[PDB]
Amino acid sequence: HHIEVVSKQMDPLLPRFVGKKARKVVAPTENDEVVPVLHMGEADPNEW
Amino acid sequence: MTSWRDKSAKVQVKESELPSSIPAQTGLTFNIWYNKWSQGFAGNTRFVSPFALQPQLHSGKTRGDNDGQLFFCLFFAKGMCCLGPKCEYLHHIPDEEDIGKLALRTEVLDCFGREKFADYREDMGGIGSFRKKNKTLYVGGIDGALNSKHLKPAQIESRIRFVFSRLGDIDRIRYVESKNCGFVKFKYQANAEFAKEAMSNQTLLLPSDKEWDDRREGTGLLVKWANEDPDPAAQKRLQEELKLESLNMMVHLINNNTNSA
Amino acid sequence: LLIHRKGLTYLHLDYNFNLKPTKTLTTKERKKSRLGNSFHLMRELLKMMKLIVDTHVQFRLGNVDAFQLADGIHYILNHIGQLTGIYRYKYKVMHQIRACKDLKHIIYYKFNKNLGKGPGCGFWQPAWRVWLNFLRGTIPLLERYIGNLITRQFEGRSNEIVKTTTKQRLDAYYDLELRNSVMDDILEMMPES
Amino acid sequence: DEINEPPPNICEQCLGDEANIRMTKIPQGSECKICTLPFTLYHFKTSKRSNNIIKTLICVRCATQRNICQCCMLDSRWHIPIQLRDHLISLVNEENVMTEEAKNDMMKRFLSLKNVKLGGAQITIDASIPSQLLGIKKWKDGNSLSLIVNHKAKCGGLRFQSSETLVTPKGLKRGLIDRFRI
Amino acid sequence: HSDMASKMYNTDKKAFLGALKYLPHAILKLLENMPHPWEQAKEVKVLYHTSGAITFVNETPRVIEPVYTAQWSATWIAMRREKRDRTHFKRMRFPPFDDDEPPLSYEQHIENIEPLDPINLPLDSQDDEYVKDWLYDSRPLEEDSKKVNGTSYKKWSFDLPEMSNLYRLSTPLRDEVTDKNYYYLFDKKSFFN
RNA sequence: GGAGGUCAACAUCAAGAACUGUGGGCCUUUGCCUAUAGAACUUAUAACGAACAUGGUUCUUGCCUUUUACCAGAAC
RNA sequence: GUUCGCGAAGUAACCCUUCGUGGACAUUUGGUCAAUUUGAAACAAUACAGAGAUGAUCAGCAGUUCCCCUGCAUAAGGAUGAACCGUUUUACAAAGAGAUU
RNA sequence: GUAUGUAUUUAUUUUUAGAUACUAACAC
Numbered sequence A: 001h002h003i004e005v006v007s008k009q010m011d012p013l014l015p016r017f018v019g020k021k022a023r024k025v026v027a028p029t030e031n032d033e034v035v036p037v038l039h040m041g042e043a044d045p046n047e048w
Numbered sequence B: 001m002t003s004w005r006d007k008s009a010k011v012q013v014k015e016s017e018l019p020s021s022i023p024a025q026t027g028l029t030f031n032i033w034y035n036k037w038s039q040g041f042a043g044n045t046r047f048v049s050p051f052a053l054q055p056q057l058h059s060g061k062t063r064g065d066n067d068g069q070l071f072f073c074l075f076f077a078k079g080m081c082c083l084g085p086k087c088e089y090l091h092h093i094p095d096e097e098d099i100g101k102l103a104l105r106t107e108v109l110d111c112f113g114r115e116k117f118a119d120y121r122e123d124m125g126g127i128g129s130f131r132k133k134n135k136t137l138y139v140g141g142i143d144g145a146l147n148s149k150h151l152k153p154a155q156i157e158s159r160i161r162f163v164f165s166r167l168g169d170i171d172r173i174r175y176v177e178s179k180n181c182g183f184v185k186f187k188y189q190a191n192a193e194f195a196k197e198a199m200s201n202q203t204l205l206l207p208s209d210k211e212w213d214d215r216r217e218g219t220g221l222l223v224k225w226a227n228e229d230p231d232p233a234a235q236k237r238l239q240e241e242l243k244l245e246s247l248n249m250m251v252h253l254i255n256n257n258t259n260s261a
Numbered sequence C: 001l002l003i004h005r006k007g008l009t010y011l012h013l014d015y016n017f018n019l020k021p022t023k024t025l026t027t028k029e030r031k032k033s034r035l036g037n038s039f040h041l042m043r044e045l046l047k048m049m050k051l052i053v054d055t056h057v058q059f060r061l062g063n064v065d066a067f068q069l070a071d072g073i074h075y076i077l078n079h080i081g082q083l084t085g086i087y088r089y090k091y092k093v094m095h096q097i098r099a100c101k102d103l104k105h106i107i108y109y110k111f112n113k114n115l116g117k118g119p120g121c122g123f124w125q126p127a128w129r130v131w132l133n134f135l136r137g138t139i140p141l142l143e144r145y146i147g148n149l150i151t152r153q154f155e156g157r158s159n160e161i162v163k164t165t166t167k168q169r170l171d172a173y174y175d176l177e178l179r180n181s182v183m184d185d186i187l188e189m190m191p192e193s
Numbered sequence D: 001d002e003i004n005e006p007p008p009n010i011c012e013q014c015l016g017d018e019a020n021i022r023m024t025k026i027p028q029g030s031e032c033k034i035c036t037l038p039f040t041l042y043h044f045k046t047s048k049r050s051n052n053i054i055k056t057l058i059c060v061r062c063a064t065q066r067n068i069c070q071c072c073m074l075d076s077r078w079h080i081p082i083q084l085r086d087h088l089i090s091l092v093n094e095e096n097v098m099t100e101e102a103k104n105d106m107m108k109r110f111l112s113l114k115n116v117k118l119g120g121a122q123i124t125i126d127a128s129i130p131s132q133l134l135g136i137k138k139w140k141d142g143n144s145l146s147l148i149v150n151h152k153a154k155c156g157g158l159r160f161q162s163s164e165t166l167v168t169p170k171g172l173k174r175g176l177i178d179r180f181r182i
Numbered sequence E: 001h002s003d004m005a006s007k008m009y010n011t012d013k014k015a016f017l018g019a020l021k022y023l024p025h026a027i028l029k030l031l032e033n034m035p036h037p038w039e040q041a042k043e044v045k046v047l048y049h050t051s052g053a054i055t056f057v058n059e060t061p062r063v064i065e066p067v068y069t070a071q072w073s074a075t076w077i078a079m080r081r082e083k084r085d086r087t088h089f090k091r092m093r094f095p096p097f098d099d100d101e102p103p104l105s106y107e108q109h110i111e112n113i114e115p116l117d118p119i120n121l122p123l124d125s126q127d128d129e130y131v132k133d134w135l136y137d138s139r140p141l142e143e144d145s146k147k148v149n150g151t152s153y154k155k156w157s158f159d160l161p162e163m164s165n166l167y168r169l170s171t172p173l174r175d176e177v178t179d180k181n182y183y184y185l186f187d188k189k190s191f192f193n
Numbered sequence F: 001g002g003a004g005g006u007c008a009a010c011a012u013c014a015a016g017a018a019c020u021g022u023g024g025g026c027c028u029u030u031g032c033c034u035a036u037a038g039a040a041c042u043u044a045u046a047a048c049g050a051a052c053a054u055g056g057u058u059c060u061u062g063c064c065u066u067u068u069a070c071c072a073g074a075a076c
Numbered sequence G: 001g002u003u004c005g006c007g008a009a010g011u012a013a014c015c016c017u018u019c020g021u022g023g024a025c026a027u028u029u030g031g032u033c034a035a036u037u038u039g040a041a042a043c044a045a046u047a048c049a050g051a052g053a054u055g056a057u058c059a060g061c062a063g064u065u066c067c068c069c070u071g072c073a074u075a076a077g078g079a080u081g082a083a084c085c086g087u088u089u090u091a092c093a094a095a096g097a098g099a100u101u
Numbered sequence H: 001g002u003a004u005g006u007a008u009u010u011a012u013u014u015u016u017a018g019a020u021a022c023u024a025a026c027a028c
């Protein structure tokens, strides 16, 4: 069917972006893989 | 055909007769933006419709017919339409053919051309969901009959049957004596929508019986969307129906899938 | 429409654009109903316009006169201080009024020479020029304000709102940066747990 | 950028038989019927002159996750309601693949943002004792019809007509208990 | 749109609040076109929003500078004569209308009622013979091939005798000081310094 | 084809006292030197406007409980 | 409906009218939206409650939150804006002494 | 001469004297 895409001129008075409305969202954190966290006391506590 | 097809639709209400906007004094002062009332809260605002339809009497051809529009005039469903044959939308009760035309687009939106919402509504309100095809209307506030008590429930049952019966092809009806509710079920989603918008806020008994001329003081009957049926019987019945229909469309899947190869 | 849309139906506007409460207000009302300089400023401004447009109306009704008119709009444009109350919401406008008084005196002496102390007058060019240029000034200012008022009215106020350090909350922030900075060190000296 | 870049998803069905089509693109339209977040909207008309107008309801994300059509909200391939295709699939295997959806708000508003791709998507006067549409249909073709009554709790009820009813008496009984009502 | 309570207005209402941002501009364009005393009624080009959201006056007044000064000074003299003349000069009351009276509709009251003569001046037949005719026209010279560009009305051109008459009329508003050297320490650069 | 328009779009309008094109020579396109043609609008008591408003940041003040609203000078 | 033209008829003497026909001129608007109860403004009123640090009365600034409101605001207010003021168990071991298999 | 907060469901979803007292926009 093809297509042709065309913008519509807004009535300048009416709000442009009819749906832009401040709302807050919690995004998920999508973890695909794990990043290995790779690193290399006794009397010490008496000091610390 | 002889009834509806030939005879062009007749204006239900003169435009001067239509109700005014600005419903009356639910509060202290009027409000321009939202159309409601300002301070204080008057006793809850609901009222019987001054209007109703008359399926064979009013319904007739209109401009949508020649223009091939899909969607039905709701002001007709309320019998309040003032545009008569000039109306842009169809005036007549939904049949199987026209639902045949809507069938592609009946999924997202009702027969009146209004998008459905996802979750229904807290109280099972106006328009349904596009998740679940629901053909079953809850009839409540049966005191739309006002205060007349009746010889039996066959009064209520019989009367309701004769009400909705006009509006479309009914699969079943059950009135409940204990808690006042009818449950009415249709062939088609479309007729359910149409009937819901048609019979909301309406009265009962005869064009004249007893208190008839005082009917307009009544509250009017809720027609809402109905929940599932908890009893095991109809639950079996649904499960089976879903089964056999799933089976039926598997035929399509394998016919066009067979054409896919 | 902007008043009711905000939900306040108990503030009445008259037809001279004075905004009065129609009721005694609970405190919550007085908080909801304090309107900013955007609205009020624009209200005062229209009130000026309506005022003049009215004088010309009463001329066309025949109710007035030719000369009484010109004296009229002269009287307006000079006495805006007294007739409006725009001077409340931008105090800067007090410059124009001072200007529009001075012209008055300069104009009167040439006009009034040899004849009279009375009201007869009606050379309104200069004052008109002043008010007009002042109005050039606040076009962008009101576009900005009322732009924010209405975009906030449809779209809700911003959720982020970071807030800068100023004279009042400084010491608090200084405390805060400090306690953090000590947390880092004393966590990084310790051996482990 | 993020919202525009994915192109729309439209069925071939509802998009009509026209060779070339003109569709409008609004960069912030209504929110989804589902996720309740803004997106980019598309008009079009099937016919050039067709009065009716088609408006994509859901997101691109909220669609892609479910693998459906934005105008139809039918499955992208089989043209099936979502609540069905997952039942067919659920018939194979045993019990699964139901699409669990998002009450509250930021449950859903949250949910649309993950890349999960969804459970469903991955595979893709005569008294007669012992519905009403069937009775009225069969009795409708053989004579005059006025009203029917059945109480399924009682499993029996009236059939009333306005002679022709005796024409019905040929096939009515035992098909079914049918007698002449009082 | 005066009465709107219907649902059909739900966009137009949104449309109103939007225009609230552009109003002060419309107040400017309206108010710089004031009709001036010698004119009875200006007629302007407005540009309106199709839903009746707001109405701009789209024009800018252009006036030949010498002619404009002549006009305005003629009115000046007429003002003085009239203030000397009549004993009781009655300054109209402010505001013109009371708060409860809705602004009367122009299409009814005003449009039928005839304009009631403006300032002008008696002029003179003999002396001003050149400028007597066109001096008080709304736009002084519109159709002339020689005297002005066109109806677009920029780039005026005149003759000597006209400029002599305009130069005559404008004496009360004319600069009058014929040499530079009079301003000695009053020029700009002496003020900056 | 001529006159216009309270019509539009696209160019251009603050700088070595200042623009552009072209011919020729050197370096190796830029750039320098030389030759030639045309330069609308705006500029010397300096500028598109013979007119004149507002805002932001930063300093200095002025009112002076604090914030908006402000006092009156400067620079950007 | 205008104009170019052709043919027929009539008035006519190539003109005036009627008729028929060829060609040119002119070429796809609008809607995200349908007109009161069932797709959604909060206020107010009534009842109950009754304002942080403290022994007690009073200024306040912040900080965290999927709470925001008034404000043009990245000033500032909204009780120091509100909520917070509670529930609370395992990276678990080592040594010694007594009872049972 | 208390912000502020909580609740405001009506229309019927299938099977004998008084002391020690606490407090009171009530009286310097």
Ligand SMILES: O=P(O)(O)O[C@H]1[C@H](OP(=O)(O)O)[C@@H](OP(=O)(O)O)[C@H](OP(=O)(O)O)[C@@H](OP(=O)(O)O)[C@H]1OP(=O)(O)O
Pocket (backbone or CB within 6 Å): C101, C104, C108, C112, C116, C117, C118, C119, C120
């Ligand atoms: O201050 P005053 O000595 O009374 O001067 C007044 C006064 O002018 P100012 O108030 O500007 O100084 C009047 O104005 P208001 O009393 O209304 O403020 C003004 O009358 P208008 O207001 O009608 O102009 C009047 O004008 P006039 O000179 O015609 O009397 C003028 O008089 P003097 O300046 O001559 O005293």
Ligand SMILES: [Mg+2]
Pocket (backbone or CB within 6 Å): none
């Ligand atoms: Mg403070």
Ligand SMILES: [Mg+2]
Pocket (backbone or CB within 6 Å): none
């Ligand atoms: Mg605060």
Ligand SMILES: [Mg+2]
Pocket (backbone or CB within 6 Å): G079
């Ligand atoms: Mg406190």
Ligand SMILES: [Mg+2]
Pocket (backbone or CB within 6 Å): none
């Ligand atoms: Mg406080």
Ligand SMILES: [Mg+2]
Pocket (backbone or CB within 6 Å): none
């Ligand atoms: Mg706080």
Ligand SMILES: [Zn+2]
Pocket (backbone or CB within 6 Å): B073, B074, B075, B076, B081, B082, B083, B084, B087, B088, B089, B091
């Ligand atoms: Zn209709």
Ligand SMILES: [Zn+2]
Pocket (backbone or CB within 6 Å): D032, D034, D035, D036, D037, D058, D059, D060, D061, D062, D112
């Ligand atoms: Zn979505």
Ligand SMILES: [Zn+2]
Pocket (backbone or CB within 6 Å): D010, D011, D012, D013, D014, D015, D069, D070, D071, D072, D073
């Ligand atoms: Zn589709």
